[PDB]
Structure formats: C-alpha cells, structure tokens
Symmetry: D2
Subunit: 125 residues, 4 copies
C-alpha cells in the first residue's frame, strides 16, 4: 500500500470520536471506532477498503469504511458508512462524508438515513 | 446472525450490477461486487458490517459496505460506500444510498463525491 | 423556457405526494407541495430554479426547489431541498435526491439532516 | 420572520463564495449567489424558503435555497440546492449540506449528483 503507512494509526474527528485503523497492503481497512456522539458506547468493529495505488499528482487516496452500531454494550440498530479520501503531509487529514441508516419499517423507510461529514486528523480537538 | 441466512448470497441492482456477499455470525460482510456501470471491470473486493441482532418489530436490518475500485484490471481511484437496510420476505430487498468519492487535489475536493441510491433484489432486472 | 411547458403542472412521487409547479421563462419555479409522508398537512409554498436552456443531446434539465415545512396548520421546524432533473417524453419524469434539515441545537447538529430520493411522474401511483 | 433580520444580508463560505439574501416575513428567501469554485461566473439568481417561526429552545432555523447555474455569462447545465440551518449570535452561521445535479442522459443518470457541505459566516475567509 502506498499510504499504508500514512493511513494506519489513530485519527480523531471534530466531534472527538476516535478512529483506529490498520491499512493492509491489499487495500483492506480494519480497526475500531469510538463515537463521542449518539447512541454509542465504547469501541465498535469497522472494516473498509482503500485505493492501494493512488494517483501521484497530488490527489488524495479514496477510501471508505462501515461501522454497524452493535457491540456488547449497546445496539442502535443502525450503521454508518464513511466515504472519503486521505490527504497526506504535515497536516494529514481524512476528509469524509457519511450515511447513517437506521433499521425502519416500510412506512418509515423514507426517513431512515442521516447524512453528514467528518474531518479526521492525527491530533485531537 | 439473525438475517445471516437472509443476507448471504447474490443480489442484483437496478443497473444490473451483481453483489455477492457472506454475512458472518458476528456482523461481518465479505464478498465481491461487479458493477454494470462506470469505470469498473470484473469483480472487486468488498467488506462491510451489519446489525446481527435487529429489532423484531418489522424494521429492516441496518448494514453497509465499501468497494475501492481497484483490481487487477482497472483502477478508478475511487471508492463507494453503500449504507442501507435488508428487508426480508418473499420480495426481499436491500435498499441503499451510496457515496462515491474520487481522489482529488485540494482545489477540487469540493467536487469529489457523488451520491445516489441502489435497490438490490434476489432476482435480476 | 425550453421545458417551461414540460415542467409546468402537477407531479406525483412514489409516496403519493403532490408537487404543483409553474416554470417561468427566466428559470423560476413556483408552486405548492403536499406531502403524503411525515410531519406535514395540506399544501406548502415552494420555490426553486431550473436551467431554462438545457443541452439538446438527450440530457435532462437540471432543477431544484425548497419547501420549508411551515403553513397555517403545522410547523415541523424543517426544510427539504430537492435537486434533480426533468426528463421529457411519453414517460416524463423528474428524478431527484433530497436533503431534509431540521432545526437542532449545537449538540445535535450532526444528526440534523436526512437524505433520500423521490421520482416524480405525471400520473399517480 | 423571527430571524428575518438575522438571515438577511451577505454571507461567505469556506470556498470564498458570496451568498446575498433577503428573508421575507412569510418565509421567502431571494437573492444572488457568486461561486468561487466550479463552472460559474458572476452572480446567479437564487430562491428558497426558511422557517419563519423557529423553535425558541436554542435550535437553529431550518432553510434551503436553489441556484440554477445559468446566467448571461455561463450555463453549466446544473443546479445546486443547499439545505441547512441558520444559527444566530456573535458567531452566526448558516450550516448546510448541498446537492449539485447535472443534466445527464439516461445512461449517465447514476452519476448526475455531487454532494457536499458549506458553512457560511458573516465575515469572509
Ligand atoms: O446514534 C446512532 C449510533 C452512533 C452514530 C454516531 C455518528 S456516525 C456519524 C457521526 N460521526 C461520529 O463520529 N459520530 C456520529 N444511531 C442512531 C441513528 C438514528 N436513530 C433513529 C432512531 C429512530 N428512528 C430513526 C432513527 C437512532 C440511532
Ligand atoms: O466509475 C467509477 C467506479 C465505478 C462506480 C460504479 C457505481 S458505485 C454506485 C453505483 N452502483 C453500481 O452498481 N454502480 C455505480 N468511479 C468514478 C467516479 C468519478 N470519477 C471522477 C474522475 C475525475 N474527476 C472526478 C471524478 C471517475 C471514476
Ligand atoms: O416530517 C417532516 C416534514 C415533512 C417531510 C416530508 C418528506 S420531504 C422528502 C420526502 N418526500 C416527500 O414527498 N415527503 C418526504 N419533517 C421532519 C424531519 C425530522 N424531524 C426531526 C425531529 C426531531 N429531531 C430530529 C428531526 C421531524 C420533522
Ligand atoms: O461547476 C458547476 C457549477 C458551479 C457549482 C459550484 C458549487 S455549488 C456547491 C459548492 N459551493 C459553492 O459555493 N460552490 C460549489 N457545475 C458542474 C457540475 C458537474 N458537471 C458535470 C459535467 C459533466 N458530467 C457531469 C457533471 C459540470 C458542471
Ligand atoms: Cl421511528
Ligand atoms: Cl478532475
Ligand atoms: Cl431531537
Ligand atoms: Cl458526462
């Protein structure tokens, strides 16, 4: 992986959530997520993928991951996906937008999905 | 997994893409994705998560997955995340919304992410 | 307006909501919206814009509109924007994706916005 | 309008775009938008709506607006909708997420819509 070394490690977003990830040489992301917001407690499993051979023209590295919000402490019957890109350097960042879907009945499916954006950095707010 | 049996298998969306997935007892999703649209050829790895203990009131099962659009044939420097829910029964479906992020420079990050929606069923269009 | 005649009139979405709109020669959209779903009763004002000189290569006509969910009967402290395109012909359609923002405190702004998609046609479901 | 006075005026986002708006007592937004990014030149008409009787518990004021990207200088065959909320006070802000739809053929409709987020303040970056 080109940014295997750059992506692997601990990241923090603007809410104070903590994203711990290992980028594998093949394109795998694995790790844990702890949200500072919402119906969440302690760490949750995450998994995702990244482009292991990004362009070399200054473009970011595309990636995504998923958390289902069930662990031994809580189940929020929901899942978030973050889609974004890693941008390396002295002020490295993972810039994302996310979709948070809740389990809903038929009648309520139209209101099942929240959208937002998180920016992750290597130092915490 | 409650819908481990229901989610595992082959799904098809409205574009004719094919989503092959195994749901693990823990909440894992693993499999392959073949897109009928866009800068894609053959199968790509996917990974994701689902709620393995959904509500029993008729609500769907929340889930999500990621594809990074790199394989041995093509690299589109991009990744899609699908966030949605599985709804079982005779007309089982996975209803999703997705975010497709491309690697972009600084100047172009504002235009890095497409949004859309896919509906997957067990029989093809 | 090129599709002034095509856009003007009554449209219905998959939820059974009714969208009544007048497209002005300049690019204006004005009208009323009645939602079959959610915290809504009777008609609400809408306003928006469309491309009054679309491409002639078979592409759709880009457009958007807003409803704030306050009228004399109800206030849901929220607003939806639909962004999409009109596609003319015998099976004319307005294909959209929408963002529904609620008024929220600081602590809750991350969960203020729902996302979805509506397809409008000239005949009702 | 409760925040008629607060919303009316000039706002600037993180890209340096300028949003000039008048909030009417009824819930109307009218004005002009000048984008610092993308296929845009000079000012474009906008129109939208806001909640003219927001909650009084510290929640923001929901609102939305549309720009179709046609004026006398340029036509980008596209339209953006911003959905968000006004938050008053010494550091007043309009926090938004947006959908930017381009006119596309049938074959390409799946890739017609960009998503992002803008934060507007009364002082420029
Ligand atoms: O709060 C969570 C789980 C934690 C999400 C944390 C989010 S992930 C994006 C953002 N970035 C973070 O770092 N943290 C936040 N899930 C909800 C979803 C909406 N829910 C319902 C309930 C009833 N009807 C509809 C919807 C209730 C449960
Ligand atoms: O086409 C793909 C990869 C395949 C995506 C297939 C998509 S996934 C959601 C939907 N459901 C499917 O089943 N299939 C489609 N990626 C693009 C993204 C945008 N790209 C750029 C290039 C230059 N600047 C900006 C953006 C070009 C590459
Ligand atoms: O239901 C409505 C107003 C009517 C929306 C109708 C929607 S527009 C897109 C779709 N297409 C239609 O044709 N119809 C639907 N608004 C909500 C939003 C979420 N709300 C809260 C409350 C508390 N906390 C958070 C959020 C409650 C009020
Ligand atoms: O660039 C613009 C018009 C100006 C948009 C400015 C955007 S509004 C949200 C953000 N906040 C701002 O303040 N400024 C930006 N429109 C594009 C859309 C994508 N386009 C295509 C072309 C071909 N195929 C697919 C898509 C090309 C034209
Ligand atoms: Cl609910
Ligand atoms: Cl580009
Ligand atoms: Cl609330
Ligand atoms: Cl194109």
């Amino acid at each position: 992986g080109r940014d295997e070394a750059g992506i692997t490690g601990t990241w923090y977003n603007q809410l104070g959530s903590t994203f711990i990830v290992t980028a594998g040489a093949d394109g795998a992301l694995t790790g844990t997520y702890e949200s500072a917001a919402g119906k969440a407690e302690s760490r949750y499993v995450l998994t995702g993928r990244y482009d292991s051979a990004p362009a070399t023209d200054g473009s970011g590295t595309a990636l995504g991951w998923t958390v289902a919000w069930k662990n031994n402490y809580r189940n929020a019957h929901s899942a978030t996906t973050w889609s974004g890109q890693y941008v390396g350097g002295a002020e490295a960042r993972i810039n994302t937008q996310w979709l948070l879907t809740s389990g809903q009945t038929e009648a309520n499916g139209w209101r099942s999905t929240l959208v937002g954006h998180d920016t992750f950095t290597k130092v915490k707010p």
